[PDB]
Design a protein around this nucleic acid. Structure first.
Ligand SMILES: Nc1ccn([C@H]2C[C@H](O)[C@@H](COP(=O)(O)OP(=O)(O)OP(=O)(O)O)O2)c(=O)n1
Ligand SMILES: Nc1ccn([C@H]2C[C@H](O)[C@@H](COP(=O)(O)OP(=O)(O)OP(=O)(O)O)O2)c(=O)n1
Ligand SMILES: [Mg+2]
Ligand SMILES: [Mg+2]
Ligand SMILES: [Mg+2]
Ligand SMILES: [Mg+2]
Lengths: 373, 373
DNA sequence: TGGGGTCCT
DNA sequence: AGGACCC
DNA sequence: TGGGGTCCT
DNA sequence: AGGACCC
């Protein structure tokens, strides 16, 4: 129960793919998906002209005035497609982990070994790779670990062909020995391709990063913190002092991110199953008076109710969130949780009141249904 | 799936019972179990002389200078007996809920109905009660609800006989239609007896209380809050305004405690199963220097390790707690959680360090192992 | 600088 | 409740 | 005023 | 993390 074969599957310009499938006339045209003033993502034709992900409409448009834009505020369709993709990956192997709407990890370890036991003592010399090999590294067919990672590159290719054939979506995959590597290597060949990482090239991959905020797990916060100590490259982090780090982020934050800086990462691929929550969010900077704005709350609920319904499970908690304005508070949402009266659980009318009263004990508003059962 | 038959089982002077079984020479002598300066509980011979639960050693001793005292700081034995009792109740019906070391709720609804279907259309006129009937109320053998509550009083009597015969422990039981009533009525006949609550006497029971802090669920906090509004008796609470209450404790705290004030309570008896946590706590007011005091931390761990071990499940988190001194801060413990390094999970040496470092990011100290799996 | 979503403390 | 991290 | 323990926000 | 509630 030690060496693993994990794949990370990461779809191409996901929202824009889904919009291009819905309206084919958007193909071959540079496309951006807008949400308020933000171009959240764009198709590859777009990125050729300079549009980057999370550009504002303005910069997007003055970098490329020929850009089509469609609204992506409503996530319904993306969320549906997102689950269609996870469910299809669950068929290859039950344990799939989601990350956002367009990433999935799958532990292919049991699958690879079953395939290897089916191959006679002869064809195993014919095992080939599918896709790119990170760093152009040579394969060694007598290396058991190379053989398992190639077999894993083949399962990957089959998952991508099925995603294409069955749902019409393209994507990249990365095959590696842990989740951190598999995700870092799935991006090496961007558009609709896959890459496999052999152990000998782990260090090359991790040292190819230009700053530790590129390591999955180190976010906006730890990043500035690590800086304050002089730690800027992944090597700085590798060689920095455990004690001084240990004692400045807590043994947890520290002992973990240091392992990552080496490419080491033992977290298991967890089963995501159905969501732990369902929320809708509306935005209207400056428009929320602070009484005239409740009707918005009934807006969110209308959809929420129909969604939560469907899954089936009924939520046993509700939550309401906000955010106020003037200077850049960087950080500042407020909320009030509350249990969903048991009668209310088995419709719209009351909810409004819970929320309204929940509203008073209290830029933008949202509603979350959690604690599903 | 509506009317229930629930029993609440509540053992007599639990710690002192266990001490009297271990040292029979303590029988018939007034006994108090001490923890530091507190007489946490005493046997009934004691309470005759004035010793009340949670009296200080002094008041206990000047109220009764003939009082034997044994130390009950180490809970090991009480905890063992506590699980022996729950496991024996689980045999009658799988769903047992614990509350503290000496209370258990059991939903006897399915059991009662199975027994009623086994009784021919004749002996059912002979169904009798076992124990006291709260308020001396008359039974009506044609009342299906009376019949089910009597059958439930019989299951209760059988559980108490088994607790006695199998583990040597006596206790009280209360049979009622929900958890709140079953617990309120289990105390009406204190020492080693049982009482059953028929629906017609619910109001009499609930109005027999002298203040709302006597209702399970209303604690030290809500109590003072309800006061601030004039709400003192259970009737005040019953008749107080939902809105003004709703909006002063939150719709949750309010809509719930108001139901309780009526005797209404729909919470289901939950399965407690194995514990969600294991902790040890040591006390030494004023003795913790704030470096000389870590050895204490290794004390707690020694036992913890052996305990957590046993259950089997390994904890995936550790926690360390404190509390400082001068004026009565009423309220004031501090803690720092931290994940238990995976290598450490499958021994003593490191733990100490996690705790020590956990100790520095930081009257008494403790260690908790949680997040079992 | 959107609209979601997960787990920890 | 709020924080941190991810897409 | 002990030494535990549970669930919520 | 801390709060509230229970034994
Ligand atoms: N901060 C973020 C990150 C992403 N997304 C949405 C828009 C994307 O379509 C989708 C997936 O995130 P990715 O980083 O994968 O972006 P893409 O799939 O769109 O692009 P790529 O093709 O570079 O993987 O999630 C978002 O709304 N907000
Ligand atoms: N604040 C509290 C409450 C109780 N206990 C311990 C000592 C008791 O023996 C046991 C059970 O609590 P009870 O209220 O049931 O007290 P008793 O069983 O001891 O007495 P009774 O016979 O009145 O039920 O838990 C405790 O240590 N601290
Ligand atoms: Mg992605
Ligand atoms: Mg993507
Ligand atoms: Mg009790
Ligand atoms: Mg008791």
């Amino acid at each position: 129960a030690s060496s693993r074969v994990i794949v990370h599957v990461d779809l191409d310009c996901f929202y824009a793919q889904v919009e291009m499938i819905s309206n084919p006339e958007l193909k071959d045209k540079p496309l951006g998906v807008q949400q308020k003033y933000l171009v959240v993502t764009c198709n590859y034709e777009a990125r050729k002209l300079g549009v980057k992900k999370l550009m504002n409409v303005r910069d997007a448009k003055e970098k490329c005035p020929q850009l089509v834009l469609v609204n992506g505020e409503d996530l319904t369709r993306y969320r549906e497609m997102s689950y269609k993709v996870t469910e299809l990956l669950e068929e290859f192997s039950p344990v799939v982990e989601r990350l956002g709407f367009d990433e999935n990890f799958v532990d292919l370890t049991e699958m690879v070994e079953k395939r290897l036991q089916q191959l006679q003592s002869d064809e195993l010399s014919a095992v080939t790779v599918s896709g790119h090999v990170y760093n152009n590294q040579s394969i060694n067919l007598l290396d058991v670990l190379h053989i398992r990672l190639l077999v894993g590159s083949q399962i990957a290719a089959e998952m991508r062909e099925a995603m294409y054939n069955q749902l019409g979506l393209t994507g990249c995959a990365g095959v590696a020995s842990n989740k951190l590597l598999a995700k870092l290597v799935s991006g090496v060949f961007k558009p609709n391709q896959q890459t496999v990482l052999l152990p000998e090239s782990c260090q090359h991959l991790i040292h190819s990063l230009n700053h530790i905020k590129e390591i999955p797990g180190i976010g906006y916060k730890t990043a500035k913190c690590l800086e304050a100590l002089g730690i800027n490259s992944v090597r700085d982090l590798q060689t920095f002092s455990p004690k001084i780090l240990e004692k400045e982020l807590g043994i947890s934050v520290a002992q973990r991110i240091q392992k990552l800086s080496f490419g080491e990462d033992n977290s298991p691929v967890i089963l995501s199953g159905p969501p732990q929550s369902f929320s809708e969010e509306d935005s209207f900077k400056k428009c929320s008076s602070e009484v005239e704005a409740k009707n918005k709350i009934e807006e969110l609920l209308a959809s929420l109710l129909n969604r939560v319904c469907q899954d089936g499970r009924k939520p046993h908690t509700v939550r309401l969130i906000i955010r106020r304005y003037s200077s850049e508070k960087h950080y500042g949402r407020e909320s009030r949780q509350c249990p969903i009266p048991s009668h209310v659980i088995q419709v719209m009318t009351p909810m409004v009141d819970i929320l309204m009263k929940l509203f008073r004990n209290m830029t933008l508003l949202s509603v979350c249904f959690c604690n599903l059962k």
